[PDB]
Design a binder for this molecule. Structure first.
Ligand SMILES: Nc1ncnc2c1ncn2[C@@H]1O[C@H](COP(=O)(O)OP(=O)(O)OP(O)(O)=S)[C@@H](O)[C@H]1O
Ligand SMILES: Nc1ncnc2c1ncn2[C@@H]1O[C@H](COP(=O)(O)OP(=O)(O)OP(O)(O)=S)[C@@H](O)[C@H]1O
Ligand SMILES: Nc1ncnc2c1ncn2[C@@H]1O[C@H](COP(=O)(O)OP(=O)(O)OP(O)(O)=S)[C@@H](O)[C@H]1O
Ligand SMILES: Nc1ncnc2c1ncn2[C@@H]1O[C@H](COP(=O)(O)OP(=O)(O)OP(O)(O)=S)[C@@H](O)[C@H]1O
Lengths: 624, 213, 225, 82
């Protein structure tokens, strides 16, 4: 009876049917059975990576025993699951644990080979009770003669951390390696399991959802193993759908909460006996009104669809895989396809000219959302080079801005510091047994989190010509391996390698300098090697406009703004001279010609906050 | 009387109004809910660099439960603030922390699934060994307790990802830091608490200048 | 007059971190207006240069300056013994009243290639790793100093590929992978190119010694009389 | 400092005022703490000669009744400087 006090039951639970059904895995269960029915040392120990199913096999065996499809010598055996936790509850005295263990053992033995014990996670059996080894090997004698059967399942990277260290005991265990299944079998596992969730949540599930989940869970979530990271997506999708059959669906509840927030904020900001609140409140009213409009419109569309979404589809899976591991993989739900078709003229607001490069980048971003790109290859690996002050770094930062709305969310590494070969360990981590090892890599542990960022390589040509060889794999596919041996995924990050090779020779001499400063098999990895071109005096006028917009936006912190006349506006561009230094001289000119005088006036009174100042040209300089 | 001297009641605390009025972050509360309402393996873990409000989300969920704004199968769950600093603390014998942990687990699983649990800084769950923080897995990966957690990026990577077979029982909710506008919103929300504590007044221009500097 | 204001917060955030961020409280404006002459009591001569540095400080503290770029990256050069280092020291003495509160590094030592590691650090897995880099450590605290580069003509043309991105962004990354901000420092790097030649015989030395990608970064190239 | 006072402290019922040395504090409250976000440092370097002289001349009568001999400012300043 001590069993009924220190252990649960499993065959009973199977008979009353509380165990999730088990599908496939026929060879593993057959091997487990033929091991569990031998003469001496009959102990199978299921081994394998975590998640691939190591307890589901045992519960399948329990179901098979209840049914009756097992061989003759395994009839009506009443599998039991031990509990090494509640066996050491109170044993502060000397023998209160060995007594319980001996009780359980002799009770198993007095049963004429009926019981088949099942210790889950049996790598916790080593240090049962210690003080000098005395316990945990009291079953070492009974194992050999095959008194108890002791099926158990433990993970793979601990069977060589705890047990393998004690090879006197490991010898009594037979290993049954359990490999991870493929998508074709995961689809079947899901098709069989697609009833318990469909019942627990009052919803229905379409087979397209199963297939799409079993595909995306293998393509994107590259951290867990297949039979589980697939089921999780389906489960979360069904949960969300049930949460939407509640009062209101998503994308309207959030807008109404936001409207209530802006309301409670505009109400309490109105009673401001201040002046700095005038221009701060005038926009809050606009925002509240223009969000309430969208609230009413969504409301009307919902009432229409309700007067004229009951089971999950193959796109809610995509929404879950986008909300988790924030890679976006939806189906372009009409809210942004205009933005994608506009990407060119939307990036043109921060870069002027270089339509060739903007077209290439826009194409490489577009043809990846429509699922036409190479599924195991990065989203594109560009190296665009040219003379200085032309806009390459600016274009990269503008692209990261358009994509993320936060320029400080990309990965930027200055390859001008990697002049020494041995400094490559900075981005790959140090091998095991050295100083910096617990912190792992740096670029690697930056990409391993949020793997949608943009990667940027300033001044690629400054580095020692041995750093170049770490990137070969990074550009060929998306794999890099840090010190701990693990592998990160670069399949969906946009690499960019700025440079300055061939300053101003020609549009062809630089294509003979690059081929001489690189290897033949490194150029082969990149996409088109974009060549930038200098600026034209007709193109600097818009640059002047952009610089003045920037300066006004930065001045709006002191509630000033300027009114620039076209004389000065074209004079500034007429001082964009010397087509060798790009467009920075224009910035230093704006500083030297406006900022100094503006500050001189500003800190000498007479330009008190508020009133705008107009700038007007003069014979040589321009006054305010 | 098991989880009565090793735990408080965060829900009753929020009912007594002694919590701070979280403002915003509806995406993360909705994600935490649609994870906590799953069938098996329902344990979210709030992850993000330190200081960005990884607990504030849990207080927000508690306030929302108390107010009654949650789906059908989430009403009256009384989330509990568990702690291990006072379970492994006084024990000098063989197998004594185990009796306390098992008493707590037993008291949880006797009652129906309405004792949603909350361990803060759960990187203190892998120790206690000497076979501890490891007897909990059979109840974790079956949806018996819910175990809302909160841990920093560094501590997470250093303490848990070395124990892969346990990390599987968890779900990550990347709680990124907010931007300047959301910060201004939060500050304006919290203004009154400090304005009451210190008998002074605070100007909106001062709040904006603080959030910008 | 019993409530906090939008400048008490600036008072706090300047009361620590040392940055003088504010809205030009009184006295400070008098000192700034009275700068060219107040700096002249220590630097006789060189009328053209003092105006430039003074205007840089004026712009930076008046509220019109790009918040993400250093507060100035001047490189002034000229004949020997004219007062370049002394002008830099007089500046640091002006806006700190502490002559030993600036971070000068003598580029005369870095004639060797590998000696750059002192101001960067060492990669993970090498001898001095947990110590960091000298310059980066000195700047991570005291984020208001006046960096100096004594006679940057000795270090052979490889150290010019760290300043190349220290300038124009105020970024630097040490061994541990951290990042530091130079956005409110005044980089100053002297030289001795020329040595007698006219302005058009030294403005050829600069071009033939450095690169366009470099001369384009830093601000006005002041010549000393 | 461990993990037993932080759940008590991040609730607002107790107020502890501690003390330690600089390098020691840099050891036990920086690596294994993760608690430094709820501790405010206060620095007391060292008094000077002129200050410890005032301290002594303030704390003189107590001993002039403990033993009771006599005290001289010359003796006080000599002790301080030496
Ligand atoms: N052949 C299968 N048929 C049906 N469901 C399966 C099968 N293999 C795995 N599963 C399911 O996939 C999940 C795997 O869970 P488990 O196998 O219990 O985890 P595990 O294999 O024990 O790994 P650990 O290390 O013990 S957490 C469960 O939801 C199982 O129901
Ligand atoms: N096409 C452009 N549109 C807008 N601004 C531009 C453009 N080209 C240059 N600029 C301006 O010039 C500045 C310098 O350009 P950058 O691209 O940052 O220099 P760069 O292209 O990286 O050249 P190098 O080789 O790195 S020195 C930018 O920050 C802009 O202010
Ligand atoms: N959305 C929010 N609404 C209201 N207060 C917030 C919000 N986000 C942060 N706060 C406040 O900001 C501070 C953040 O403190 P906590 O979130 O409790 O610290 P934490 O997020 O747990 O980080 P660690 O890991 O514990 S140091 C508290 O004072 C919160 O009240
Ligand atoms: N205009 C000046 N005002 C004050 N002192 C000056 C002036 N011109 C030169 N000196 C003095 O000249 C001496 C040399 O000045 P430094 O700036 O230290 O030399 P330097 O400019 O570094 O020249 P090199 O190339 O480095 S040797 C110092 O004692 C200065 O005080």
């Amino acid at each position: 009876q001590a069993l009924q006090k220190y252990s649960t039951d499993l065959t009973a639970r199977a008979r009353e049917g509380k165990l999730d059904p088990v599908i496939g895995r026929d060879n593993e269960i057959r091997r487990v059975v033929q091991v569990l029915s031998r003469r001496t040392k009959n102990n199978p120990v299921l081994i394998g990576e975590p998640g691939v199913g190591k307890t589901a096999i045992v519960e399948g065996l329990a179901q098979r025993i209840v049914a009756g499809d097992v061989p003759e010598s395994l009839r009506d055996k009443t599998i039991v699951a031990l509990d090494l936790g509640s066996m050491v509850a109170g044993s502060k005295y000397r023998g209160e644990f060995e007594e319980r263990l001996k009780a359980v053992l002799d009770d198993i033995k007095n049963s004429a080979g009926q019981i088949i014990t099942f210790i889950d996670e049996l790598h916790t059996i080593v240090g049962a009770g210690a003080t000098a080894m005395d316990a945990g090997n009291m079953i070492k004698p009974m194992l050999a003669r095959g008194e108890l059967r002791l099926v158990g399942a433990t993970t793979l990277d601990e069977y060589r951390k705890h047990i393998e260290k004690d090879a006197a005991l490991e010898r009594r265990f037979q290993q049954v390696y359990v490999g991870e299944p493929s998508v074709e079998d995961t689809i079947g596992i899901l098709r069989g399991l697609k009833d318990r969730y469909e019942v627990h949540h009052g919803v229905r599930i379409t087979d397209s959802a199963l297939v799409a989940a079993a595909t995306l869970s293998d393509r994107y979530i590259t951290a867990r193993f297949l039979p589980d990271k697939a089921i999780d997506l389906v489960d979360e999708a069904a949960s969300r759908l049930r949460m939407e059959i509640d009062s209101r669906p998503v994308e309207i509840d959030e807008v109404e909460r936001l409207v209530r927030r802006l309301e409670i904020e505009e109400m309490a900001l109105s009673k401001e006996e201040d002046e700095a609140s005038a221009e701060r409140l005038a926009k809050l009213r606009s925002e509240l009104a223009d969000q309430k409009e969208k609230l009413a419109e969504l409301t009307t569309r919902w009432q229409n669809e309700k007067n004229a979404k009951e089971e999950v589809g193959p796109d809610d899976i995509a929404d879950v895989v986008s909300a988790w591991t924030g890679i976006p993989a939806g189906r372009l739900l009409e809210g942004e396809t205009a933005k994608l078709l506009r990407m060119e003229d939307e990036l043109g607001k921060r870069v002027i000219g270089q339509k060739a490069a903007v077209t290439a980048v826009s194409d490489a971003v577009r043809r990846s959302r429509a699922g036409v790109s190479d599924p195991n290859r990065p989203t594109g690996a560009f190296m665009f080079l040219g003379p200085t002050g032309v806009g390459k770094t600016e274009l990269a930062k503008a692209l990261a801005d358009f994509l993320f709305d936060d320029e400080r969310a990309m990965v930027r590494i200055d390859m001008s510091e990697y002049g020494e070969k041995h400094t490559v360990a900075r981005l790959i981590g140090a091998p095991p047994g050295y100083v910096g090892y617990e912190a792992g890599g740096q670029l690697t542990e930056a990409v391993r989190r949020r793997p949608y960022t943009v990667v940027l390589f300033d001044e690629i040509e400054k580095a020692h010509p041995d750093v170049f060889d770490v990137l070969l794999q990074v550009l060929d596919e998306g794999r890099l391996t840090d010190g701990h041996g693990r592998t990160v995924d670069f399949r969906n990050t946009i690499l960019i390698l700025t440079s300055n090779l061939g300053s101003g020779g020609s549009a062809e001499q630089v294509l003979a300098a690059v081929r001489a400063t690189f290897k033949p098999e490194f150029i082969n990895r990149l996409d088109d090697v974009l060549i930038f071109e200098g600026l034209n005096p007709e193109e600097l006028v818009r640059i002047v406009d952009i610089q003045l917009a920037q300066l006004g936006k930065r001045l709006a912190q002191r509630r000033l703004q300027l009114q620039v006349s076209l004389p000065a506006k074209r004079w500034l561009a007429q001082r964009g001279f010397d087509p060798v230094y790009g467009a920075r001289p224009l910035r230093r000119l704006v500083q030297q010609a406006i900022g100094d005088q503006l500050a001189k006036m500003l800190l000498a009174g007479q330009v008190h906050d508020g009133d705008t100042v107009p700038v007007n040209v003069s014979p040589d300089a321009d006054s305010l």
